[PDB]
Amino acid sequence: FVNQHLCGSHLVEALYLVCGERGFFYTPKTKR
């Protein structure tokens, strides 16, 4: 963890761990 490869569910869960209950504005390579 902390510095690693991350994809799909693992990247979504890492974003929820980093951002907390506020979540993320990102969408998985959809326009962003």
Binding site: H5, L11, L15, C19, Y26, K29
Partner: peptide
């Protein structure tokens, strides 16, 4: 989008913070 970094190369919490609400 950060999937095109994290999924094939390395990324980190400081780079995930850039996408937080």
């Amino acid at each position: 989008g950060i999937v095109e970094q994290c999924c094939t190369s390395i990324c980190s919490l400081y780079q995930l913070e850039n996408y937080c609400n």
